[PDB]
Amino acid sequence: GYDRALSIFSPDGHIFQVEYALEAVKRGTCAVGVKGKNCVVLGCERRSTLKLQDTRITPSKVSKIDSHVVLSFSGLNADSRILIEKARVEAQSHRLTLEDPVTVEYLTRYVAGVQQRYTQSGGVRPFGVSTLIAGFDPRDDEPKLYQTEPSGIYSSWSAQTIGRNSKTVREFLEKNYDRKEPPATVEECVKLTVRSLLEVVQTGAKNIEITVVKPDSDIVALSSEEINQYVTQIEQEKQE
Amino acid sequence: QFNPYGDNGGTILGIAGEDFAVLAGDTRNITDYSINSRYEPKVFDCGDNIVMSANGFAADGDALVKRFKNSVKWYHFDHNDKKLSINSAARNIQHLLYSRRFFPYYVYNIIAGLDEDGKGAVYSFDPVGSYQREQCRAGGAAASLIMPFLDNQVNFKNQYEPGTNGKVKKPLKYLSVEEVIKLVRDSFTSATERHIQVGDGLEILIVTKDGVRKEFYELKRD
Amino acid sequence: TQQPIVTGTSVISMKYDNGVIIAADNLGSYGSLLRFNGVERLIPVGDNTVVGISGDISDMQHIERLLKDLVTENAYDNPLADAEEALEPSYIFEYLATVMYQRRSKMNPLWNAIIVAGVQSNGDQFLRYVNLLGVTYSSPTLATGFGAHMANPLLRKVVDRESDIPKTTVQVAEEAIVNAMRVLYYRDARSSRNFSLAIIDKNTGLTFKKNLQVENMKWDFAKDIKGYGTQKI
Amino acid sequence: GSRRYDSRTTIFSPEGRLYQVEYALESISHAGTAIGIMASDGIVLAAERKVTSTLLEQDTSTEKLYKLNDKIAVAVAGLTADAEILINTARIHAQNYLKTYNEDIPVEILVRRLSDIKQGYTQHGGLRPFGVSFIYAGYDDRYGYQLYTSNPSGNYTGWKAISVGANTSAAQTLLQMDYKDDMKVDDAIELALKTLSKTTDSSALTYDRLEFATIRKGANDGEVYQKIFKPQEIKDILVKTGIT
Amino acid sequence: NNYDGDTVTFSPTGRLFQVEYALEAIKQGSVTVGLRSNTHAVLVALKRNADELSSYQKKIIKCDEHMGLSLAGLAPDARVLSNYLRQQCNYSSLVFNRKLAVERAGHLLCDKAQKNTQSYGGRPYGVGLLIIGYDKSGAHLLEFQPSGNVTELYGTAIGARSQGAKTYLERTLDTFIKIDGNPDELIKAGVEAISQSLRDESLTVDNLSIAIVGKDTPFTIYDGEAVAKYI
Amino acid sequence: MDIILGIRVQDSVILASSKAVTRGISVLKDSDDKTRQLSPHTLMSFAGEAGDTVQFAEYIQANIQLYSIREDYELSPQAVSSFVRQELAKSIRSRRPYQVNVLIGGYDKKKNKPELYQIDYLGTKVELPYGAHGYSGFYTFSLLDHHYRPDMTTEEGLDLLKLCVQELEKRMPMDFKGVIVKIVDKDGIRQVDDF
Amino acid sequence: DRGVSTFSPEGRLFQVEYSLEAIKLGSTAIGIATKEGVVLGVEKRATSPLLESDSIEKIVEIDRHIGCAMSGLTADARSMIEHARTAAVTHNLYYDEDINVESLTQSVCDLALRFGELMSRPFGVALLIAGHDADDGYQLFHAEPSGTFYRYNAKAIGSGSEGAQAELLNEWHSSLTLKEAELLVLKILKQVMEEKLDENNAQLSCITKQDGFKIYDNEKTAELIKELKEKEAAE
Amino acid sequence: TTTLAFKFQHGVIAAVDSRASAGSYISALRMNKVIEINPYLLGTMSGCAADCQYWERLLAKECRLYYLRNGERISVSAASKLLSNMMCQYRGMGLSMGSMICGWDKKGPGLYYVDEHGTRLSGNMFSTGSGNTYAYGVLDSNYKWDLSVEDALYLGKRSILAAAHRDAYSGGSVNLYHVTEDGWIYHGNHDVGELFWKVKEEEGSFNNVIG
Numbered sequence A: 001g002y003d004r005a006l007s008i009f010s011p012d013g014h015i016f017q018v019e020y021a022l023e024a025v026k027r028g029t030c031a032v033g034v035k036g037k038n039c040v041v042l043g044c045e046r047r048s049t050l051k052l053q054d055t056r057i058t059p060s061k062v063s064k065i066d067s068h069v070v071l072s073f074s075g076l077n078a079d080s081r082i083l084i085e086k087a088r089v090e091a092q093s094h095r096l097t098l099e100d101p102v103t104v105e106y107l108t109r110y111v112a113g114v115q116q117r118y119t120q121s122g123g124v125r126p127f128g129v130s131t132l133i134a135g136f137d138p139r140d141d142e143p144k145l146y147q148t149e150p151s152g153i154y155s156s157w158s159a160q161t162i163g164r165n166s167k168t169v170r171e172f173l174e175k176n177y178d179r180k181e182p183p184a185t186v187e188e189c190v191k192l193t194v195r196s197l198l199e200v201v202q203t204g205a206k207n208i209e210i211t212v213v214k215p216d217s218d219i220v221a222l223s224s225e226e227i228n229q230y231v232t233q234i235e236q237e238k239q240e
Numbered sequence B: 001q002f003n004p005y006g007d008n009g010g011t012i013l014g015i016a017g018e019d020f021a022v023l024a025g026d027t028r029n030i031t032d033y034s035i036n037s038r039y040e041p042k043v044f045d046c047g048d049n050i051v052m053s054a055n056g057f058a059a060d061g062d063a064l065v066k067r068f069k070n071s072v073k074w075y076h077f078d079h080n081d082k083k084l085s086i087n088s089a090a091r092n093i094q095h096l097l098y099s100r101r102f103f104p105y106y107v108y109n110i111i112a113g114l115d116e117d118g119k120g121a122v123y124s125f126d127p128v129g130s131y132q133r134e135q136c137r138a139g140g141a142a143a144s145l146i147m148p149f150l151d152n153q154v155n156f157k158n159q160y161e162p163g164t165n166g167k168v169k170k171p172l173k174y175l176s177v178e179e180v181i182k183l184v185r186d187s188f189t190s191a192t193e194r195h196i197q198v199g200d201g202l203e204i205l206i207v208t209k210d211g212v213r214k215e216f217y218e219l220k221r222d
Numbered sequence C: 001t002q003q004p005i006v007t008g009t010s011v012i013s014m015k016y017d018n019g020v021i022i023a024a025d026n027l028g029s030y031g032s033l034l035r036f037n038g039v040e041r042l043i044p045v046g047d048n049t050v051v052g053i054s055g056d057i058s059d060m061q062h063i064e065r066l067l068k069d070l071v072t073e074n075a076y077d078n079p080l081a082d083a084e085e086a087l088e089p090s091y092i093f094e095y096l097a098t099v100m101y102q103r104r105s106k107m108n109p110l111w112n113a114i115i116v117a118g119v120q121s122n123g124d125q126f127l128r129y130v131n132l133l134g135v136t137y138s139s140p141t142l143a144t145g146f147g148a149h150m151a152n153p154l155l156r157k158v159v160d161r162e163s164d165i166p167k168t169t170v171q172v173a174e175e176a177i178v179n180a181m182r183v184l185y186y187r188d189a190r191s192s193r194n195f196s197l198a199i200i201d202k203n204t205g206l207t208f209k210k211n212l213q214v215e216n217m218k219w220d221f222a223k224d225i226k227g228y229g230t231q232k233i
Numbered sequence D: 001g002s003r004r005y006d007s008r009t010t011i012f013s014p015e016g017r018l019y020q021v022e023y024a025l026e027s028i029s030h031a032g033t034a035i036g037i038m039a040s041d042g043i044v045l046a047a048e049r050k051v052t053s054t055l056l057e058q059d060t061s062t063e064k065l066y067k068l069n070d071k072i073a074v075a076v077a078g079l080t081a082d083a084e085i086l087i088n089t090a091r092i093h094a095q096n097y098l099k100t101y102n103e104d105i106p107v108e109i110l111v112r113r114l115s116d117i118k119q120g121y122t123q124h125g126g127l128r129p130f131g132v133s134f135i136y137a138g139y140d141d142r143y144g145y146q147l148y149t150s151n152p153s154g155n156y157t158g159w160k161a162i163s164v165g166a167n168t169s170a171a172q173t174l175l176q177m178d179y180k181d182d183m184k185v186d187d188a189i190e191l192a193l194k195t196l197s198k199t200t201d202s203s204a205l206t207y208d209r210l211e212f213a214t215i216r217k218g219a220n221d222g223e224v225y226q227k228i229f230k231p232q233e234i235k236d237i238l239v240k241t242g243i244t
Numbered sequence E: 001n002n003y004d005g006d007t008v009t010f011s012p013t014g015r016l017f018q019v020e021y022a023l024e025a026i027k028q029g030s031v032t033v034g035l036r037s038n039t040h041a042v043l044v045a046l047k048r049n050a051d052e053l054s055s056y057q058k059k060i061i062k063c064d065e066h067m068g069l070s071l072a073g074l075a076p077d078a079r080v081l082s083n084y085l086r087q088q089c090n091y092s093s094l095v096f097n098r099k100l101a102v103e104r105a106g107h108l109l110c111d112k113a114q115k116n117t118q119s120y121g122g123r124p125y126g127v128g129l130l131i132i133g134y135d136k137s138g139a140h141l142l143e144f145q146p147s148g149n150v151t152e153l154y155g156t157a158i159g160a161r162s163q164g165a166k167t168y169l170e171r172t173l174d175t176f177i178k179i180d181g182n183p184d185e186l187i188k189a190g191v192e193a194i195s196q197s198l199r200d201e202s203l204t205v206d207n208l209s210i211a212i213v214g215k216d217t218p219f220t221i222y223d224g225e226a227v228a229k230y231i
Numbered sequence F: 001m002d003i004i005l006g007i008r009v010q011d012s013v014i015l016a017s018s019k020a021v022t023r024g025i026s027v028l029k030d031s032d033d034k035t036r037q038l039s040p041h042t043l044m045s046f047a048g049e050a051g052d053t054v055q056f057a058e059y060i061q062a063n064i065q066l067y068s069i070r071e072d073y074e075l076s077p078q079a080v081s082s083f084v085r086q087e088l089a090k091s092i093r094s095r096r097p098y099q100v101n102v103l104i105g106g107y108d109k110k111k112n113k114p115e116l117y118q119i120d121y122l123g124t125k126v127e128l129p130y131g132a133h134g135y136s137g138f139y140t141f142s143l144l145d146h147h148y149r150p151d152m153t154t155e156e157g158l159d160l161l162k163l164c165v166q167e168l169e170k171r172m173p174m175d176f177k178g179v180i181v182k183i184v185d186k187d188g189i190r191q192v193d194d195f
Numbered sequence G: 001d002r003g004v005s006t007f008s009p010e011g012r013l014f015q016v017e018y019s020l021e022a023i024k025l026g027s028t029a030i031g032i033a034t035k036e037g038v039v040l041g042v043e044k045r046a047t048s049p050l051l052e053s054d055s056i057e058k059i060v061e062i063d064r065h066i067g068c069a070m071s072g073l074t075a076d077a078r079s080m081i082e083h084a085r086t087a088a089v090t091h092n093l094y095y096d097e098d099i100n101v102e103s104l105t106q107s108v109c110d111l112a113l114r115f116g117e118l119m120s121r122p123f124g125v126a127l128l129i130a131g132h133d134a135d136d137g138y139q140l141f142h143a144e145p146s147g148t149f150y151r152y153n154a155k156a157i158g159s160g161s162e163g164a165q166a167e168l169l170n171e172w173h174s175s176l177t178l179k180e181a182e183l184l185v186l187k188i189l190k191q192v193m194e195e196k197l198d199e200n201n202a203q204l205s206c207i208t209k210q211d212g213f214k215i216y217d218n219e220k221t222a223e224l225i226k227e228l229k230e231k232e233a234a235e
Numbered sequence H: 001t002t003t004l005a006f007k008f009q010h011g012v013i014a015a016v017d018s019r020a021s022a023g024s025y026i027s028a029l030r031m032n033k034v035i036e037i038n039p040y041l042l043g044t045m046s047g048c049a050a051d052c053q054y055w056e057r058l059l060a061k062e063c064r065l066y067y068l069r070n071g072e073r074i075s076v077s078a079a080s081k082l083l084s085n086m087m088c089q090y091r092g093m094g095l096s097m098g099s100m101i102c103g104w105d106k107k108g109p110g111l112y113y114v115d116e117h118g119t120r121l122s123g124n125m126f127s128t129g130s131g132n133t134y135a136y137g138v139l140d141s142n143y144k145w146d147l148s149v150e151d152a153l154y155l156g157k158r159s160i161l162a163a164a165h166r167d168a169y170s171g172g173s174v175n176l177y178h179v180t181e182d183g184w185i186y187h188g189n190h191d192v193g194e195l196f197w198k199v200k201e202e203e204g205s206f207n208n209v210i211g
């Protein structure tokens, strides 16, 4: 078998393949995650270079891993499918062996472990993908939002963004998001998620995707018109 | 058809004192109605103040002891010459036996020594690895002959204090090594009389804080 | 799992004051057929060990080759192969015992009963038995098959315990062995008159005697025996 | 040892791109243009054969349009040999699904499977990727008529109209201009051929330089029919639309 | 230069640079001395610490009751090779009821190290070993190099500044070989030998490591206050 | 385990499964639910060798749930039944086959039709208006053959099911401790708590 | 290119030496061993204020009697921790006892050099393994990707290691109490850290014979930080 | 063997005998048939002693690893399933193990029966072994959810006594356990010989037996 060590240390103590995998994430479309008091919202950019697209059948950016957990990403699209499939298999494997659905933290730890494994295994390259994993633990009303990256490190975030121009939207979130009082309602949480994407997106038409996840496996994706109403209200307040 | 097992007879006996332990076994080795050897040692000093005897099928018994002695050696290498405690040895032997759950070591194993508080300890095993610490145990051919005698003379079972008539039991004293060795010798002399596979010789290994000591006694050769 | 085809019967042996004696007949039986009459079942290993084998002859020939290869392998990169690092009876035995027990544990045994007789470096007598089950034991006298039932009782009258060994001379021990071989010829239907005898002494070394015959046999009394009860003529 | 001669086909550039995937796409950009147009009542697949000869046996020839099953077809852009390896795998996958569930495979599931195979060659194994871009035209009872594309990266996307191969930039602009949502198959047929006729590197677009196919519910009642156009039928539709 | 990228490549002069670089790791390692008489064999090792808060890296490893070694270079490689020796010593005992000859132990180490010098992908061992033991032919001392070369010696030393101790033993050859039935005097000669390789630092209680094996002496290691006697 | 029954009426599928679990000569449990929800509109009851039944059912459940998440779509009862059959047909020629018989009751939301599939451990699939496994059919099929109509209501289906259980309770030597009844229709799966 | 298991002309493995450079870039972790217990402390170093700092888990339990702190590529530590936990509990299964800290550390270090062309590269993380057993008492070990482990009375790893180690050189003595060690870790962490030390960006932990391995609450650490400030202002 | 365990208002009672047999020969008078997996988890043992000891001690290894990875005690449901999955690997290989996994977790007190077939049953009351039928007789007629800790402990004790008396392969002594939300509590070893005569006098039962 092909055993070649592709991810290796350089003289300065860097693993370039893992770092170049982060550059692939930087190229990917912007993804944002914001957790309110009783919900988490996942926002995703859709680049408008691709029109004549069939939005019914085109792979959505946010993917359900289980009925209570979702996963969005930034980076290589093909790479993300492999992590999502593995995560989905593990989610069912956990229910089958332990008789409880995975916690969001466990699922994140697994996906992060897969990414890490691909940084010190022979014949393979790292995943050019960073993920935002969000949801609610079974019989728990505390929101959960985690991030992973090609190196395999993961951590919990009150709010986070990844992908292209993520530096700008993170800048926005750092000054707008208050920890002492997070978005109390769904509206406020979605509004803040749309506002953050409007710093980067370009047009607020079909370029913004929003997915709201609430406790007890209550996951819904907002439509174009519903999002467009947020886009309208934000700019009308801005004209002042 | 090839039968991979055999029966080499013999009988073993372990008794735990207050600050000592004994492991005794007859020295006769047999197949069917023939004597192979009148003196074939069956109880071994395995190191770390532990004595061991695997009674039943001699080939499996020699293999197990040999493996446990090896396990003690590697325990020293791997854990900075740390002493293997009797409870740790017992657990280790369970895993040696269960590694063969589907092609068992056909032996009844006993180990004896001192626990980490200096008190006498005896551990008993079955062929597939179930074990337990006990105060006394006879294993092998004449085990059913000897055990009831030890229940009576070591644990004072069915013995009550005269005058009370079954109301007050005989109190559980602790026996001395000299008293224990008498029960061991009488146990084997009685077993030799009524069991054809038992006889020739008796070898006793006594374990104290000072070390392992041996005692040998002749038995009837018929 | 197999069955033995061509077989060798009893191997008998005993310790004496300065060494060990071992003996075995020269027959290779094919069931009830006394097929092969020139079979050597005592196989010397160096000048200090003799391995006596009973049971399946094809497996014996295999073991014979393992021992021959063992000597070859021991000499490799060994300047002291004919001195301090020469093969000992205890090394040869433990090797065979390891092989026998491994083969039985794979349910494919070497269908044999082996007695390794020899003298160690320190002059100590070595005599140990091993068989197809990997069962091992040692005794002042050892015998396989029928020898266990008929020879041991006779040899144990000479050396009944360990303390009788220094009192037993090579002449007495050899005489006992030779008498035992005669008794086996009387009573073992799978035995032969021709046999081999080996003596390993700590002083005189290895003496290997071939083409020995059972002699001084009692048959004359048979003429008087008539019928099976009531017949007089 | 062998390391000396390893090109390392599955590595990132400093910019975070996959070298071999990018170079495979460069290869595909020289391949004959293939166009897919999805309408309300069917799908059109049109493709240009590369500089043919008069001595090429066209009626028995197939380099662009392949049948995966009765409901799904693909247009190829790139190495034909590479495409046939993947096509046969996709045909097997569709049959495995049909054997397992006793239902025809949904279009996306088949597309995802092939795209995952392509992805694998970019992440592990040390082998070169498949120099192939597909346009998948198919139908199932969930989403109805569907167009997808996949490329050597293993990434796939859904489309109303799309082109792969040569001059996709020009072709996509022309499709984006004239395409409408309420469009029908007969109109889509005309759009596909007109787009090829303007983007082609050849002097003139003729029947012998084209492969053409439609997937229509224009089959007797609620069912779908695949039509791989014959040379004479391509010649007729070229006259009908007013190109020759 | 162009021929040191892997162990599978000879240089134009017939040299194996990866093996030579592995040999270099031994020279960087702390000094250890080996010497024997006809009755006993002794290892003396200068242990090295990382700093004042750290412990002193152990240098001597026991392989059997009658055999053991001291290391100089990559310690993990010594653990791998000593583990192999433990298994081989143990195979000889379990199968043949035979204590492994020290000479044969050297031949086994040579062959194990050699395989790593001729195959692609792997690397040579980066450690040197001094093996002592007492077998049927008396006391023995071996020097192992990861090139595969194993040498039986009366005395030797490996590690940094080992040339000083090696010269001393070369002078003292006729004296220390005759130290029979006197373990303390043989150790003294070893401690005096390793002292010739010291600069700036001296032999302290947690610095010095000594091992001995002999006729009626199992392989035992002396550390801590057990070696204060010899300081 | 022992008795599992199934009946497909006008607008629903009804599955009845015994509650008894026996080890040796002792009935360990009299409230065991011999069923697993494979998807919101698909229920599978099971009966066979001890241990194998639950392991197989949960394995099938995990696979269908995995499919549902991957495609964000519920498989038709027919597709699920075919998947289950293949697994059993695959299993029968394995080293140690799974000795499990199943009934799959589902409501096809596309066709708006209830569907009942009977599959035995060999992988023998049949679509039926009513079905059973083991000896259950010997007692109950005569009643079902007589009384069954395809336009029956759910309530009439339950009444005919009661008659089947009453016949089983009269003529079987075996005390199966009553049945848990579940209904599968357009609105999903629900349990009849009083039967 | 070149072999992964290649020796340099100086006699060092290139990859092992390069992994050590990655560890120098890691966040600071400090361990101090005393006769009343071993203290482990780490710099969390959150990359952003929105990152929930309590999810940063750089101090980890291996067993009840063994703890562990990490520095470097912390993702690499997860498989090492998993192996350590397995080795600890497996030995308890085989021997009905706690495993020696040294033996546990040795088991972890056996993984280190299992790389080649096994895993494709060495670990890019160093571990401070602290614990207690009956034989050798309270112990602190430093496990490197070279496969080497040194025992330490006190040790600092990470970006501010050489500065912290020099400080530990002066401050450590054999009669330190547990409370004194806690303040000493906090003091040195505060010295080498970029951002201002508080209960949210720094974490303490300890291992005692009685209570076993414990990670300190942010409320408990906050008091020790306040106690530190006052005693430094006292002179 | 005879073992039992049942849920009630104040947790779960677990009672076992202590006899071991090898044919008609009583090989052990006092064996521990309960394993303390953790302070809140118990495991009863019936069947092959070796199988019961090996696999339940291996379960404890796996339950301990769960705590280390998740920083949280394993549930009774999950623990029972891990064990049933082990049994399913050696499916048909000849293992003999009947066990009840007793404990307290978030859902309250938990009780699962698990056997060598891979069976896993949740319930309020179970009894395993050669004498389980005798124990069930006493349990079924005297069990309530509203039992006091004192009366519940006696019920499990008395139920084993019933089995020890009638079943030839059950006896020796009774080991009692009481599982609470603060963990399990050992309620001692009770010799059946002494307990029988005591219960006979105090309760008035076993009238047919002379004493």
Ligand SMILES: *[C@@](C)(CO)[C@](*)(O)[C@H](Cc1ccccc1)NC(=O)[C@H](Cc1ccc(OC)cc1)NC(=O)[C@@H](C)NC(=O)CN1CCOCC1
Residues within 6 Å of the ligand: B124, B125, B126, B130, B131, B132, H001, H002, H019, H020, H021, H022, H023, H027, H028, H031, H032, H033, H045, H046, H047, H048, H049, H050, H052, H053, H096, H129, H130, H169, H170
């Ligand atoms: C009752 C006593 C018998 O049904 C009960 O099931 C016990 C359960 C048990 C559980 C854990 C520890 C001890 C006892 N079973 C036994 O005692 C089993 C019964 C049995 C016999 C034979 C079997 O093979 C088909 C299966 C089950 N006995 C044993 O396991 C017996 C073979 N082992 C021992 O007696 C081991 N002891 C003997 C004394 O030294 C320590 C080991």
Ligand SMILES: [Mg+2]
Residues within 6 Å of the ligand: B191, B192, B193, B194, B195, B196, B197, B198, B199, B220, B222
């Ligand atoms: Mg007798």
